[PDB]
Design a protein around this motif. Structure first.
Motif, mmCIF file in Angstrom:
data_model
loop_
_atom_site.group_PDB
_atom_site.id
_atom_site.type_symbol
_atom_site.label_atom_id
_atom_site.label_comp_id
_atom_site.label_asym_id
_atom_site.label_seq_id
_atom_site.Cartn_x
_atom_site.Cartn_y
_atom_site.Cartn_z
ATOM 1 N N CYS A 14 6.199 -13.232 -4.126
ATOM 2 C CA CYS A 14 7.070 -12.125 -3.316
ATOM 3 C C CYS A 14 6.438 -10.985 -2.930
ATOM 4 C CB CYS A 14 7.852 -11.768 -4.878
ATOM 5 S SG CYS A 14 9.088 -12.969 -5.355
ATOM 6 N N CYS A 15 5.325 -10.562 -3.409
ATOM 7 C CA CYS A 15 4.729 -9.202 -2.911
ATOM 8 C C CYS A 15 3.495 -9.205 -3.184
ATOM 9 C CB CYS A 15 5.667 -8.154 -3.278
ATOM 10 S SG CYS A 15 6.434 -7.157 -1.718
ATOM 11 N N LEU A 16 2.901 -7.745 -2.786
ATOM 12 C CA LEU A 16 1.347 -7.667 -3.337
ATOM 13 C C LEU A 16 1.491 -6.911 -4.647
ATOM 14 C CD1 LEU A 16 -0.427 -6.973 -0.155
ATOM 15 C CD2 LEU A 16 -1.690 -7.212 -2.358
ATOM 16 N N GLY A 17 2.604 -6.990 -5.189
ATOM 17 C CA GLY A 17 2.647 -6.409 -6.569
ATOM 18 C C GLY A 17 2.813 -4.831 -6.191
ATOM 19 N N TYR A 18 1.984 -4.123 -5.729
ATOM 20 C CA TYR A 18 2.086 -2.711 -5.173
ATOM 21 C C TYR A 18 0.825 -2.231 -4.706
ATOM 22 C CZ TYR A 18 6.500 -1.510 -7.473
ATOM 23 O OH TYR A 18 7.867 -1.063 -7.897
ATOM 24 N N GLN A 19 0.916 -1.755 -3.404
ATOM 25 C CA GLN A 19 -0.252 -1.355 -2.753
ATOM 26 C C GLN A 19 -1.339 -0.549 -3.711
ATOM 27 O OE1 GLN A 19 -2.030 0.662 0.675
ATOM 28 N NE2 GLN A 19 -2.396 -0.902 -0.622
ATOM 29 N N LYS A 20 -2.441 -0.923 -3.758
ATOM 30 C CA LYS A 20 -3.643 -0.254 -4.601
ATOM 31 C C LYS A 20 -4.035 0.773 -3.917
ATOM 32 C CE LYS A 20 -4.900 -2.405 -8.864
ATOM 33 N NZ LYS A 20 -5.710 -3.456 -9.217
ATOM 34 N N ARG A 21 -4.607 0.476 -2.713
ATOM 35 C CA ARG A 21 -5.326 1.591 -1.708
ATOM 36 C C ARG A 21 -4.403 2.362 -1.344
ATOM 37 N NH1 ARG A 21 -10.944 -1.295 -1.477
ATOM 38 N NH2 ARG A 21 -11.163 -0.813 0.750
ATOM 39 N N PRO A 22 -4.901 3.410 -0.791
ATOM 40 C CA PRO A 22 -3.971 4.509 0.011
ATOM 41 C C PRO A 22 -3.549 4.054 1.322
ATOM 42 C CG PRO A 22 -6.310 5.130 0.103
ATOM 43 C CD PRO A 22 -6.294 3.946 -0.792
ATOM 44 N N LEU A 23 -2.463 4.217 1.748
ATOM 45 C CA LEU A 23 -1.837 3.744 3.152
ATOM 46 C C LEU A 23 -1.097 4.925 3.861
ATOM 47 C CD1 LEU A 23 -0.496 0.197 2.759
ATOM 48 C CD2 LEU A 23 -1.389 1.147 4.627
ATOM 49 N N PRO A 24 -1.572 5.265 4.918
ATOM 50 C CA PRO A 24 -0.809 6.186 5.833
ATOM 51 C C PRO A 24 0.606 5.672 6.391
ATOM 52 C CG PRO A 24 -2.476 5.093 7.053
ATOM 53 C CD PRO A 24 -2.541 4.492 5.840
ATOM 54 N N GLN A 25 0.958 6.629 7.277
ATOM 55 C CA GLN A 25 2.325 6.409 7.701
ATOM 56 C C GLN A 25 2.274 6.091 9.364
ATOM 57 O OE1 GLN A 25 4.655 9.167 9.024
ATOM 58 N NE2 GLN A 25 5.732 7.648 9.866
ATOM 59 N N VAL A 26 1.574 7.143 9.767
ATOM 60 C CA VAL A 26 1.459 7.045 11.363
ATOM 61 C C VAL A 26 0.913 5.788 11.808
ATOM 62 C CG1 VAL A 26 -0.210 8.099 13.114
ATOM 63 C CG2 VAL A 26 1.346 9.448 11.966
ATOM 64 N N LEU A 27 0.478 4.806 11.012
ATOM 65 C CA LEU A 27 -0.313 3.842 11.688
ATOM 66 C C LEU A 27 0.669 2.482 11.110
ATOM 67 C CD1 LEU A 27 -3.229 2.816 12.108
ATOM 68 C CD2 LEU A 27 -3.027 1.678 9.950
ATOM 69 N N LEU A 28 1.734 2.406 10.245
ATOM 70 C CA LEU A 28 2.650 1.309 10.193
ATOM 71 C C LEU A 28 4.105 1.728 11.021
ATOM 72 C CD1 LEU A 28 2.131 2.085 6.528
ATOM 73 C CD2 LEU A 28 1.112 0.282 7.646
ATOM 74 N N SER A 29 4.966 0.832 10.994
ATOM 75 C CA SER A 29 6.236 0.806 11.807
ATOM 76 C C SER A 29 7.381 1.373 10.615
ATOM 77 C CB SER A 29 6.388 -0.353 12.396
ATOM 78 O OG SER A 29 7.572 -0.200 13.158
ATOM 79 N N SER A 30 7.722 0.356 10.071
ATOM 80 C CA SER A 30 9.043 0.692 9.056
ATOM 81 C C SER A 30 8.833 0.136 7.927
ATOM 82 C CB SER A 30 10.459 0.289 10.013
ATOM 83 O OG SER A 30 10.032 -0.898 10.492
ATOM 84 N N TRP A 31 9.903 0.076 6.935
ATOM 85 C CA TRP A 31 9.867 -0.665 5.600
ATOM 86 C C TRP A 31 11.302 -1.290 5.411
ATOM 87 C CZ3 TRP A 31 12.598 1.772 1.549
ATOM 88 C CH2 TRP A 31 13.540 2.923 1.922
ATOM 89 N N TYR A 32 11.393 -1.466 4.184
ATOM 90 C CA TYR A 32 12.544 -1.952 3.506
ATOM 91 C C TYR A 32 12.656 -2.257 2.175
ATOM 92 C CZ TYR A 32 11.322 -6.813 2.746
ATOM 93 O OH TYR A 32 10.619 -8.012 2.008
ATOM 94 N N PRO A 33 13.591 -2.087 1.365
ATOM 95 C CA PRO A 33 13.801 -2.356 0.006
ATOM 96 C C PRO A 33 13.809 -3.590 -0.510
ATOM 97 C CG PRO A 33 15.785 -1.455 0.910
ATOM 98 C CD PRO A 33 14.930 -1.315 2.128
ATOM 99 N N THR A 34 13.253 -4.156 -1.651
ATOM 100 C CA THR A 34 13.390 -5.260 -1.934
ATOM 101 C C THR A 34 14.342 -5.436 -3.097
ATOM 102 O OG1 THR A 34 11.917 -6.182 -3.881
ATOM 103 C CG2 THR A 34 11.093 -4.754 -1.901
ATOM 104 N N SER A 35 14.650 -6.797 -3.659
ATOM 105 C CA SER A 35 15.427 -6.953 -4.893
ATOM 106 C C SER A 35 14.525 -7.239 -6.083
ATOM 107 C CB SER A 35 16.403 -8.226 -4.445
ATOM 108 O OG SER A 35 17.590 -8.037 -5.017
ATOM 109 N N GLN A 36 15.354 -6.923 -7.054
ATOM 110 C CA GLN A 36 14.530 -7.025 -8.474
ATOM 111 C C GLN A 36 14.562 -8.487 -9.011
ATOM 112 O OE1 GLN A 36 15.209 -4.301 -11.412
ATOM 113 N NE2 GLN A 36 14.347 -2.575 -10.217
ATOM 114 N N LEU A 37 14.989 -9.500 -8.034
ATOM 115 C CA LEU A 37 14.996 -10.952 -8.249
ATOM 116 C C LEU A 37 13.528 -11.354 -8.468
ATOM 117 C CD1 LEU A 37 18.221 -12.039 -6.404
ATOM 118 C CD2 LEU A 37 17.822 -11.724 -8.977
ATOM 119 N N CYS A 38 12.703 -10.680 -7.659
ATOM 120 C CA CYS A 38 11.221 -11.257 -7.730
ATOM 121 C C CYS A 38 10.383 -11.017 -9.123
ATOM 122 C CB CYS A 38 10.764 -10.867 -6.607
ATOM 123 S SG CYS A 38 10.822 -11.928 -5.261
#
Length: 74
Positions: A14-38
């Motif tokens: 379903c996902c990487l569990g939760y990003q462990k390393r630090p992630l910037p924002q000016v390098l990514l585009s956008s995001w989106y909330p997921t469901s608790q079904l996973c």
């Protein structure tokens, strides 16, 4: 050990569990909330190409991301 322990209904991913390393924002585009079904809901991000990320929206560094990034959807 491992043995059997057959009790779930054959899960998968379903996902990487939760990003462990630090992630910037000016390098990514956008995001989106997921469901608790996973196995672990939260907020996933999306670079500017085709890579997605998954981090606990409650992550200070992430909160900033969700603030500048648009909650993709539809």
């Amino acid at each position: 050990g491992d043995t059997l322990g057959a009790s779930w209904h054959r899960p998968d991913k379903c996902c990487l569990g939760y990003q462990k390393r630090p992630l910037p924002q000016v390098l990514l585009s956008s995001w989106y909330p997921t469901s608790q079904l996973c196995s672990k809901p939260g907020v996933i991000f999306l670079t500017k190409r085709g890579r997605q990320v998954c981090a606990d929206k409650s992550k200070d560094w992430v909160k900033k991301l969700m603030q500048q990034l648009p909650v993709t959807a539809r």
